[PDB]
Amino acid sequence: DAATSFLRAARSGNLDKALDHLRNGVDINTCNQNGLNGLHLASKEGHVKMVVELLHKEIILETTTKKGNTALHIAALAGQDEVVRELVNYGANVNAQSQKGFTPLYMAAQENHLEVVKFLLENGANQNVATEDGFTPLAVALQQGHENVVAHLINYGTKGKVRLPALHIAARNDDTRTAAVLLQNDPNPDVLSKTGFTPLHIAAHYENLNVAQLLLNRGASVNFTPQNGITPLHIASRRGNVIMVRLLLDRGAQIETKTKDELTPLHCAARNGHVRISEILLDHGAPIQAKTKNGLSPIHMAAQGDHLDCVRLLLQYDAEIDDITLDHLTPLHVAAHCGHHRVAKVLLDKGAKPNSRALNGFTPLHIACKKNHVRVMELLLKTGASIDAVTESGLTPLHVASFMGHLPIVKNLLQRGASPNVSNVKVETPLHMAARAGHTEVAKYLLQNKA
Amino acid sequence: EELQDDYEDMMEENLEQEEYEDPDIPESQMEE
């Protein structure tokens, strides 16, 4: 008699009475004479909160009635879009077949439930699944005159699962109850999305610590490496999630893992300016001289992003201040190219060579004069950079500044005694460079000084 | 809406797979 009262409460949406009956000791999987349990009766009447509560009580999601219908079948036939969404989010099989072969997509299509049809198709429902009589959702929608359902079924076709797996959605929302139900149903915590990432990647992206710990306790791979090589530790380091980085390192994340571009987590932390993550990785044994495919070290990444404190921290941990990429670009070269005069000042104060040579003989002063970065030029000239230095083609900083038309840099160089009479390998002077690029003001100022 | 994060394309855009790659080495040769 108590089970009958519980079923009546489930049908009527009286959640308090159903919870009281469950507390008293009524079996959660009890059902009426037709086989409809509390989940079925709640799904028929659109009681979403009752469905969620019963799913939290470890009710069997894939229970079938005497007609072979699951809860998803009943919710699709009854036209309850919210209940269909809730059941799908908790792991309901959208391709389940009843005794006569009906699918939830078929039941939604035959009753002109367009929203349910759209949601099921987006969640991977196969419209090619036919009943025992050979009919399809398209066929029954055509038979019943449901023009919109027919149109949507024809247009969608076989676009496939465009939604994320339910565990990924639970990890994005930090939903521990939904994730627990999903992992109870499907034991595998490393389900893959179309992109190839596990739900642990999603948890590390949003720093959802609760669901991340839940996944790791169920057997998720802390060093799951997709084709691109992006581990959850990489994502946590890039995103700035300090607590997630600590959690992943505690559970056994590998710190020397390289992506397809050979970026270590130290690179990801350094290029985004996360000082605390970089310090944690370095204290756990991160290689500070790791190089990417282009030869960039983490200090190159930190200088590239104008991350001053990250450069300071890396230099404190015995980073090479004159490490060179494949193009022989020092971090000072990168700072001069990007105009980061604060990074350049920090590098120069700790002994970075101001006259370092790249592949084409370019100094940081040459790059500063090329990119109209006056402050970097001033700092370099204060720190002993050669104002008359030449490249492999004989280009002085005045040559580059005059060719690029950067008039203030030309004026500053000429005020400090730079000679406009210098010549290239083509014997061309800065006046030649100014005349070949049509910079009238630069040419006039060059003429007014010594030419 | 407020549910685009449940789809593969929006999640892929949010995860920013390009941010984990080395784009290129900026050379910027001055020769014309």
UniProtKB/Swiss-Prot annotation, chain A:
Regulated by phosphorylation. It comes from Homo sapiens (Human). It is linked to Spherocytosis 1: A form of spherocytosis, a hematologic disorder leading to chronic hemolytic anemia and characterized by numerous abnormally shaped erythrocytes which are generally spheroidal. SPH1 is characterized by severe hemolytic anemia. Inheritance can be autosomal dominant or autosomal recessive. Patients with homozygous mutations have a more severe disorder. The 55 kDa regulatory domain is involved in regulating binding of SPTB/spectrin (beta chain) and SLC4A1/erythrocyte membrane protein band 3. ANK repeats lie at residues 34-63, 67-96, 100-129, 133-162, 164-191, 195-224, 228-257, 261-290, 294-323, 327-356, 360-389, 393-422, 426-451. The gene is ANK1. Component of the ankyrin-1 complex in the erythrocyte, composed of ANK1, RHCE, RHAG, SLC4A1, EPB42, GYPA, GYPB and AQP1. Interacts with a number of integral membrane proteins and cytoskeletal proteins. Interacts (via N-terminus) with SPTB/spectrin (beta chain). Also interacts with TTN/titin. Isoform Mu17 interacts with OBSCN isoform 3/obscurin. Interacts with HIF1AN. Interacts (via ANK 1-5 repeats) with RHCE; this interaction mediates the primary membrane attachment site for ANK1. Interacts (via ANK 1-2 repeats) with AQP1 (via the N-terminal). Interacts (via ANK 1-13 repeats) with EPB42. It comes from the Eukaryota. Component of the ankyrin-1 complex, a multiprotein complex involved in the stability and shape of the erythrocyte membrane. Attaches integral membrane proteins to cytoskeletal elements; binds to the erythrocyte membrane protein band 4.2, to Na-K ATPase, to the lymphocyte membrane protein GP85, and to the cytoskeletal proteins fodrin, tubulin, vimentin and desmin. Erythrocyte ankyrins also link spectrin (beta chain) to the cytoplasmic domain of the erythrocytes anion exchange protein; they retain most or all of these binding functions. This is Ankyrin-1. The modification Phosphoserine is found at residue 419. Disulfide bonds: none annotated. The modification (3S)-3-hydroxyasparagine is found at residues 95, 223, 421. Isoform Mu17, isoform Mu18, isoform Mu19 and isoform Mu20 are expressed in skeletal muscle. Isoform Br21 is expressed in brain.
Swiss-Prot record, chain B:
It is found in: Cell membrane; Basolateral cell membrane. Residues 1-32 are annotated as: Disordered. Detected in erythrocytes (at protein level). It comes from the Eukaryota. Residues 12-30 are annotated as: (Microbial infection) Interaction with P.falciparum (isolate K1) FBPA. Residues 1-25 have a biased composition (Acidic residues). Phosphorylated on Tyr-7 and Tyr-20 most likely by SYK. PP1-inhibited phosphorylation that follows Tyr-7 and Tyr-20 phosphorylation. The modification Phosphotyrosine is found at residues 7, 20. A dimer in solution, but in its membrane environment, it exists primarily as a mixture of dimers and tetramers and spans the membrane asymmetrically. Component of the ankyrin-1 complex in the erythrocyte, composed of ANK1, RHCE, RHAG, SLC4A1, EPB42, GYPA, GYPB and AQP1. Interacts with STOM; this interaction positively regulates SLC4A1 activity. Interacts with GYPA; a GYPA monomer is bound at each end of the SLC4A1 dimer forming a heterotetramer. Three SLC4A1 dimers (Band 3-I, Band 3-II and Band 3-III) participates in the ankyrin-1 complex. (Microbial infection) Interacts (via N-terminus) with P.falciparum (isolate K1) aldolase FBPA; the interaction inhibits FBPA catalytic activity. Functions both as a transporter that mediates electroneutral anion exchange across the cell membrane and as a structural protein. Component of the ankyrin-1 complex of the erythrocyte membrane; required for normal flexibility and stability of the erythrocyte membrane and for normal erythrocyte shape via the interactions of its cytoplasmic domain with cytoskeletal proteins, glycolytic enzymes, and hemoglobin. Functions as a transporter that mediates the 1:1 exchange of inorganic anions across the erythrocyte membrane. Belongs to the anion exchanger (TC 2.A.31) family. It is linked to Ovalocytosis, Southeast Asian: An autosomal dominant hematologic disorder characterized by ovalocytic erythrocytes that are rigid and exhibit reduced expression of many erythrocyte antigens. Clinical manifestations include mild hemolysis, intermittent jaundice and gallstones. However, the disorder is most often asymptomatic. Spherocytosis 4: An autosomal dominant form of spherocytosis, a group of hematologic disorders characterized by the presence of numerous abnormally shaped erythrocytes which are generally spheroidal. Affected individuals have anemia, jaundice, and splenomegaly. Clinical severity is variable. Some individuals are asymptomatic, whereas others have severe hemolytic anemia requiring erythrocyte transfusion. This is Band 3 anion transport protein. The lineage of its organism: Eukaryota, Metazoa, Chordata, Craniata, Vertebrata. The gene is SLC4A1. The chain holds residues 2 to 33 of 911 of the full protein.
